[PDB]
């Protein structure tokens, strides 16, 4: 129960930039006290990759009206969870481990690359000839000397708010702009914990009885990262579009569930976002000045993000083939169903598929590995998804109140 097995092959992790300990000292750079736009006492945070920070704390920050961990009068509460430094260390290492698990698959390298290149658009100016950052897409990073530096980022992983098992991908809004739906994108905050997971039922083809299994937390995280991709490229479906469950939930799950969005509706969605991208090319084109760094250069960052073409003259435009390629990647190829296939784990078959929650600890290599998750090769857990079977692999799952 000692090594974490964070580097199965090679010398160093391939996505996460440091093997952090929660007690490592603050430096100006990738370990720092930070402040979110909205006040608060600064919180210790770790920069795991360009544009991506992890805050090993319960989320009492991103919502003015959720500033406390106590229950109101399918959910789970524990006000003591993630209050000690040991737990915050375990949270950071568990999150690091899941990013490496995701990045060990071809699909996950594609997705995390798209996320990192998906910088929120500089649409903050009211002068249509000036690019400017939107400050809710930044954090304030304290330095060794005590001064603050403003830093753009794309993604924050943070612990859950009061309901420990409510995971979601949310972001700060703009008074006028709809950043998640106008091509712009915004910094995404994912509420998530690697220290709990969910159970579902499944019969594996001698009496043929029902099995009680647990969801692999790498799938759950990849689900939330897929939402983040939609939202970072500003092409999320309006949350007011629902079944009876939102379109955006069904699109993220993928598989046959996504086929319920009728194809004519998809085409309409695709055209709308094509036009949003065209508007962004135009805005870059009309740009004379930049507030807060070079005009033409920030111009290139967004040429890269949106895959825009440039003519001999210097003018940007949207290419239909490059647009269809990026949009299909983000909406059709990055899905939960496809991650299940790449990981080869058992998982709910449809987005609705239980009421069981389980405490887990994926940090020890003996419990869970980057390559195999719970289904450890060359043990009995390798077959029939025995590693996710909460009866067979009972030492890895503790059932909690529902
Ligand atoms: O269902 C949603 C929509 S983002 N979020 C959640 N709240 N608590 C758990 C989840 C969740 C998210 C993704 C999964 F793959 C499995 C469970
Ligand atoms: Zn979701």
Q: Which H or E run includes 33? A: strand 31-35
What's the start-to-end Cα distance of the chain, in Å? 28
Residue 292 Cα, ligand 1 centroid: separation in angstroms? 38
Check whether 249 is labelled as a binding-site residue: yes
DSSP-assigned letters across all residues of 210-251: PEEEE--HHHHHHHHHHHHHHHHTT----TT-B---BHHHHH
Instruction: Please give the helix or strand (H or E) that residue 56 lies within, else none.
Output: strand 52-58
Distance CA 179, CA 122 (A): 11
Tell me the two tokens of residue 3: 């090594």
Q: What is the DSSP letter of 380?
A: G
| Residues contacting residue 44 through CB under 8 Å, at least 6 positions apart | 22, 26, 31, 32, 33, 55, 56, 88
**Expt. technique:** X-ray
335 near 252, Cβ under 8 Å? yes
Strands 52-58 and 155-159 turn out to be parallel
Report CA-CA distances (Å) from 297 to 120, 201, 235, 293, 294.
Answer: 15, 52, 24, 8, 5
Q: Residue 18 domain-assigned?
A: no
User: For residues 349 and 331, what is the distance between their CA atoms, to the nearest angstrom?
Assistant: 19
DSSP state of 11: S
User: What was the resolution (in A) of this experimentally determined structure?
Assistant: 1.9
* Beta strand 289-290 pairing with 130-131: parallel
Ligand closest to 190 (CA) is 1
Identify whether the C-beta of residue 132 lies closer than 8 Å to the C-beta of residue 284.
no
| Helix, coil or strand: residue 383 | coil
Please, are residues 211 and 394 in contact by the beta-carbon 8 Å criterion?
Answer: no
Report the CATH number at residue 348: 3.90.1240.10
Give the three-class secondary structure for 84: coil
Distance CA 16, CA 275 (A): 35
Q: What angle do CA 51, 80, 78 make, to 5 degrees?
A: 95
- DSSP assignment of 307-370 equals T-EE-TTS-EE--HHHHHHHHHIIIIIS-HHHHHHHHT----SSS----EEEE----STTT-BT
According to DSSP, residue 72 is labeled: -
Q: How far is the CA of 358 from the centre of ligand 1 (A)?
A: 14
Q: Which residues partner with 77 through β-bridges?
A: 163
Q: Could you tell me if the CB of 384 is within 6 A of ligand 1?
A: no
Residue 142 phi, psi dihedral angles, 5° rounding: -75, 140
- Taking the C-alpha atoms of residue 133 and residue 154, their distance in angstroms, rounded to an integer, is 13
| Domain-embedded: residue 11 | no
Backbone angles phi, psi at 322, to 5 degrees: -70, -35
Q: Give, in degrees to the nearest 5, the angle at Cα 379 between 378 and 383.
A: 90
d(C-alpha 34, C-alpha 21), whole Å: 17
Q: How far apart are CA 192 and CA 161, in angstroms?
A: 9
Number of domains into which the chain is organized = 1
Tokens of 388: 């996710």
Angle at 95 between CA 89 and CA 99, to 5 degrees: 145
Neighbour-count burial of 160, counting CB atoms closer than 10 A to its CB (0-12 exposed, 13-18 middle, 19+ buried): buried
Quick check: 5 and 96 in contact, CB under 8 A? no
Q: Is 230 annotated as a binding residue?
A: no
User: Which has the closest alpha carbon to 45: 102, 92, 100, 96?
Assistant: 92
Measured from the Cβ of residue 66, the count of other Cβ atoms closer than 10 Å reads 13
Q: Are 58 and 160 spatial neighbours (Cβ–Cβ below 8 Å)?
A: yes
Q: Is residue 22 part of a domain?
A: no
Tokens of 243: 């079944």
d(CA 154, CA 137): 7
The ligand 1 atom at the shortest distance from the C-alpha of residue 220 is: 15
What burial class does residue 147 get, using C-beta atoms within 10 Å of its C-beta: 0-12 exposed, 13-18 middle, 19+ buried?
exposed
Contact 250, 351 (CB under 8 A): yes
* Cβ–Cβ under 8 Å, residues 346 and 389: no
What is the biggest distance separating any 2 CA atoms in the chain, rounded to whole angstroms?
73
Let me know if residue 178 belongs to a domain. yes
Inside any domain, residue 6: no
Q: Is 223 in the pocket of ligand 1 (CB under 6 A)?
A: yes
Q: Which of the residues 224, 248, 266, 336 is marked catalytic?
A: 224
CA distances from 60 to 83, 99, 168, 385 (A): 12, 24, 14, 37
Outline where DSSP puts E strands in 171-219: 188-191, 196-202, 211-214
For residue 330, the CA-to-ligand 2 centroid distance in Å is: 14
> Which phi and psi (to 5°) does residue 189 adopt?
-110, 115
Contact 132, 165 (CB under 8 A): no
Range of the domain at 152: 29-402
Whether 155 and 137 have beta carbons less than 8 Å apart is answered as no
- 248 is an active site residue: no
With residue 306 as reference, give the H or E element that holds it: helix 295-306
| Nearest CA owner, ligand 1 atom 4 | 168
Q: Cα–Cα distance between 339 and 264 in angstroms, integer?
A: 26
- Is there a domain that residue 116 lies in? yes
| 3-state SS, residue 138 | strand
Establish if 142 belongs to a structural domain.
yes
Give the length of the chain.
402
CB of 166 within 6 A of ligand 1: the answer is yes
Measure the CA–CA gap between 175 and 372, rounded to whole angstroms: 45
Q: Is residue 12 part of a domain?
A: no
């Amino acid at each position: 129960h000692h090594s974490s097995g964070l580097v199965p092959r090679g010398s160093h992790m391939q996505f996460v930039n440091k093997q952090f300990n929660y007690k490592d000292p603050v430096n100006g750079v990738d370990i720092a006290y930070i402040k979110i736009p909205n006040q608060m006492q600064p919180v210790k945070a770790f920069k795991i990759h360009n544009k991506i920070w992890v805050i090993p704390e319960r989320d009492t920050f991103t919502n003015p009206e959720e500033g406390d961990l106590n229950p109101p009068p399918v959910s789970y509460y524990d006000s003591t969870y993630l209050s000690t430094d040991n737990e915050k260390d375990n949270y950071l290492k568990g999150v690091t481990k899941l990013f490496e698990r995701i990045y060990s698959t071809d699909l996950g390298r594609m997705l995390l690359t798209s996320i990192v290149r998906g910088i929120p658009f500089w649409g903050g100016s009211t002068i249509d000839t000036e690019l400017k950052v939107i400050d809710t897409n930044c954090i304030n990073v304290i330095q060794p000397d005590g001064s603050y530096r403003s830093e753009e980022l794309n993604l924050v992983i943070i612990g859950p708010s009061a309901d420990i098992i409510q995971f979601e991908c949310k972001s700060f809004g703009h008074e006028v702009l709809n950043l998640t739906r106008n091509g712009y994108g915004s910094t995404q905050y994912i509420r998530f914990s690697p220290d709990f997971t969910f159970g579902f039922e499944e019969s594996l083809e001698p009496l043929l009885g029902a099995g009680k299994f647990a969801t692999d937390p790498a799938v759950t995280l990849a689900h939330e990262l897929i939402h983040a991709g939609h939202r970072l490229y500003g092409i999320a479906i309006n949350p007011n579009r629902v079944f009876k469950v939102s379109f955006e939930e069904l699109r993220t799950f993928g598989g046959h569930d996504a086929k319920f969005i009728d194809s004519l509706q998809e085409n309409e969605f695709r055209l709308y976002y094509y036009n949003k991208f065209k508007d962004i090319a135009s805005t870059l084109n009309k740009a004379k000045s930049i507030v807060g760094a070079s005009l033409q250069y920030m111009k290139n960052v967004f040429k890269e993000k949106y895959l825009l073409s440039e003519d001999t003259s210097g003018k940007f435009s949207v290419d239909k083939l490059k647009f269809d390629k990026l949009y299909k990647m983000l909406t059709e190829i990055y899905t939960e169903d496809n991650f299940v296939k790449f990981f080869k784990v058992l998982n709910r078959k449809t987005y609705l598929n239980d009421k069981a929650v389980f405490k887990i600890n994926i940090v020890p290599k003996v419990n869970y590995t980057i390559y195999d998750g719970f289904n450890l090769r060359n043990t009995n857990l390798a077959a029939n998804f025995n590693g996710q079977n909460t009866e067979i692999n009972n030492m890895n799952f503790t059932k909690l109140k529902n």
